[PDB]
Write a protein that binds this DNA or RNA. Structure first.
Lengths: 532, 530
DNA sequence: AAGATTTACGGGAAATGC
DNA sequence: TGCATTTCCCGTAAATCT
């Protein structure tokens, strides 16, 4: 899955390693010569024509020494610029892309979430810098021993040290990331939504892969760390994290030795204009401090915005808010997003809509079948704008409920009662009556369709059969649906004066598609209302 | 609902009031005469600076009459103390103790004569009488400070009189502090003395000494497992704490009748984490305490609940309830937590009463002896004196089945509440009958005569009926199944064909019809024969 | 008042103790 | 191990806030 630019980054990183290596060798040469210069110098003073040519050699050794410092110092600076320039591609371009991909993952997109490459690049670069700094320290030690007027260690060394410290210090900061966003174990498909009292899990990783830090750092987690008007908005609820809020970062489980810290069993408790709870947003923040080779570096990171709810019947509106947010911004910390919520093109929405099915189950929605829903948002499809109100905030067109609330419930019906049946391709599910009409027009009596109810909150399932004159039945509710499967009821259906339907549109007979999902001493009992 | 003995107690209490009244009057007479004696005495001393002769005779005679009146009073005070002493024990050890038993029978579903109004009246009447008697004894003391002589019966008797009356009042105060409502979860009103951890329960105490000066004076502290973990107590049981607000002020509020009480709501139980008995039989006590300071005295009051079983999931309740049934059916001991190490043996009489109550208080009618007797055979096999053991009843399964007699029964009770209360206790269900005696329907009656019967082949419950050709019946519809259609609806709902008469002679739709009952197509289902 | 939001708690399920 | 007991947490209902 590699890209043009990624191949250059990896190339520039091996380059940086090469230069640190080349420079190391130069330091050994300069240091030996400086040893040699001292030993001869000391010998001459000890002495107190043959003698005269030794002074000429001392003289010449020194010239070469100064030449070698200049060379080194100059090449150190070149390396710093290159590291400086390559770091910004690492941190502001490749890392920042992985962060977006996290947002798209959470809501059900293509999960290229792997940090293995990034961690490798970053640790490669970190390794390179810490050695560069040990080289600068070396130069310093050398000037303490041997200096003169004009000495380029005296003149450049502090800048070199300053640049490298600042580099390492920011790379360390970028490397502390949230590997798994807060999520309830119980609702794996709806992260960034936390109900009070129920447990959620979150994980951080330091991508600077240093073994000497194993078990060294404690991470503290918390929520609303900078609230009470620290940035903005005075109105909102405030929570605390209960359970065990600090945890030690280690390499444990041996995934690949990565430094991480995983928080389990955390709960949220409420501390007791604006926005409805469903659109209100909070941040979970992680912190720590590293002390490494002379430096103290504070690390900090935070989660994506989370919505906190208190009953689970609030989740379907809460999830929409997560969908909408992560669909349309790349900003990690915009809690006031829902005061002025962005407006989303039909393209954006439709992708995301499919993902909801395509990650609770195996296939998404077919463009034609999804496009049925497209008419429902507007009226008789690429540049069309969808507004938060059209989507979730207000009800749709005289029904008592939301477009998304209604949709989500179907997405639940598939999971609870008909998952297999759903993506066998068996369900068309979404179709307008005008275009529903073109089955019996084209096909023989007993050709049927599987369709979802629009006249209902939560969900109902429906079907097309003939006597023609197209007919259909009162959608069986879930409370009803517990007892018999929809496939069982389809194949169980008849109109005791009985009989039913024959072909799942287009040409397939009934029992081949739907028979696989089909099923003194008193009297065994199983039933169907079928018709009156 | 008054009794012979109760009428005498009330009579003896009006008597005690009469004597305190009669004595009060005697104290006024003695005190006036003593005023008079002083004033004359003082006048004679004033004189020291025939007439003066006969005044000394009157002083002399006033004094004699004074001493006479003290003796009389002191003697009658003592008589009263004995009578109060004797009447208190009937109040406290006989009438109060009976109300306490009746509480136990109430909790498990018996006749609820639980009213404390009478008791509180008697006790407050007596308390009022004693505190006045003591103010009379104090008065006698004041009088001896003023006027005494050799032989004076206040000097000689007064301390005993004071000692007896203090001890009396002090114990009557202690008996009067009681638990009016036993701990119970609001959500399970019919199963008190069973508390699940985390869920709220409510309990109430009352001081039956009806004194208005104590309104808002006393703080009651509640708690659980106080003085447990080894002051005679069994080792290795669980220990809990009460969360929420564990003290509360006693007042006369709501004006029920002005009674002093303190009600605890919203309390929860939490295990104090960090083998003798299973949790369901393990017992704890909730204790209430306070201290009263009243007219010179400090009195500690204490009381406690009946034994409670603490559970943690609600699926534990039906064995927990049995334990409450068994305990309160068979002991009158308020604090026996080791009861279930050696549990008593219960006669079929005792059990059958209690069994009916469970239906008779979740719903309107109990069990008919005939229908109840079907269950009786199930405990033993082909009943007045027959003994039932805790193991037969609840601890072990009934032979062959994988579950308890009581667990199975309780579930049926639940079934009557959740799906068929009306249909139940209309007479409409016989419900419990042996096949041998089930057989005597179509033997006597015409084809389509049916019965309503409960399943034995099932944990939780099932409901069943008679269908004839071949006597027949169907796979009992489970409660899950039963959510969708009522049993009456399904009976009357039943190429199809069903039944005609609820045994004995009643047709179908008169008894069971009252509980019965483009644009797509409205549909409802009936399994029927198939 | 009605609408929003949170609390309460059964019941099945899973985890933990023993 | 299997069995006992407790925790977990949805989902409806009721309570509370606004």
């Amino acid at each position: 899955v590699v890209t043009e630019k990624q191949q250059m980054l990896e190339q520039h990183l091996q380059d940086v390693r090469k230069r640190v290596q080349d420079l190391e060798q130069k330091m050994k040469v300069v240091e030996n010569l400086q040893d040699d210069f001292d030993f001869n110098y000391k010998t001459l003073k000890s002495q107190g024509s043959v003698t005269r040519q030794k002074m000429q050699q001392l003289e010449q050794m020194l010239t070469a020494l100064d030449q070698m410092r200049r060379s080194i110092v100059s090449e150190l600076a070149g390396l710093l610029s290159a590291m400086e320039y390559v770091q910004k591609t690492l941190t502001d371009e490749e890392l920042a892309d992985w962060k977006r991909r996290q947002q798209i993952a959470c809501i059900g997109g293509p999960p290229n979430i792997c940090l293995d490459r990034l961690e490798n690049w970053i640790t490669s670069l970190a390794e390179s810098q810490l050695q560069t700094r040990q080289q600068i320290k070396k130069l310093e030690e050398l000037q303490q021993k041997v200096s003169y007027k004009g000495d380029p260690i005296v003149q450049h060394r502090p800048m070199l040290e300053e640049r490298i410290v600042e580099l390492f210090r920011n790379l360390m900061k970028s490397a502390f990331v949230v590997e798994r966003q807060p999520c309830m174990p119980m609702h794996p498909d709806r992260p960034l939504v936390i109900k009070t009292g129920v447990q959620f899990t979150t994980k951080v990783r330091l991508l600077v892969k240093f073994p000497e830090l194993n078990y060294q750092l404690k991470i503290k987690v918390c929520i609303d760390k900078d609230s009470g008007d620290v940035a903005a908005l005075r109105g909102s609820r405030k929570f605390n994290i209960l359970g065990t809020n600090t945890k030690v970062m280690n390499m444990e489980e041996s995934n690949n030795g990565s430094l991480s810290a995983e928080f389990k069993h955390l709960t949220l408790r409420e501390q007791r204009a604006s926005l409805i709870v469903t659109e209100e947003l909070h941040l979970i923040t992680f912190e720590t401090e590293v002390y490494h080779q002379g430096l103290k570096i504070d690390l900090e990171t935070h989660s994506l915005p989370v919505v906190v709810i208190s009953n689970i019947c609030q989740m379907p509106n809460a999830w929409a808010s997560i969908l909408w947010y992560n669909m349309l911004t790349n900003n990690p910390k915009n809690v006031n997003f829902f005061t002025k919520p962005p407006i989303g093109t039909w393209d954006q929405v439709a992708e995301v809509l499919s993902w909801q099915f395509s990650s609770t189950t195996k296939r998404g929605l077919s463009i034609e079948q999804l496009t049925t829903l497209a008419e429902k948002l507007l009226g008789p499809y690429s540049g069309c704008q969808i507004t938060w109100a059209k989507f979730c905030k207000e009800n749709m067109a005289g029904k008592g409920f939301s477009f998304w609330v209604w949709l989500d419930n179907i997405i639940d019906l598939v999971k609870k009662y008909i998952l297999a049946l759903w993506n066998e391709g068996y369900i068309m599910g979404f179709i307008s009556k005008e275009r529903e009409r073109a089955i019996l027009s084209t096909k023989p009596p007993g050709t049927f369709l599987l369709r979802f109810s629009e006249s209902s909150k939560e969900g109902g399932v429906t079907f097309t059969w003939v006597e023609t004159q197209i007919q259909s039945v009162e959608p069986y509710t879930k409370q009803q649906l517990n007892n018999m499967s929809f496939a069982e009821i389809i194949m169980g259906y008849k109109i005791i004066l009985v009989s039913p339907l024959v072909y799942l549109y287009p040409d397939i007979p009934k029992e081949e598609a739907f028979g696989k999902y089909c099923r003194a001493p008193y009297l065994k009992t199983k039933f169907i209302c079928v018709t009156p």
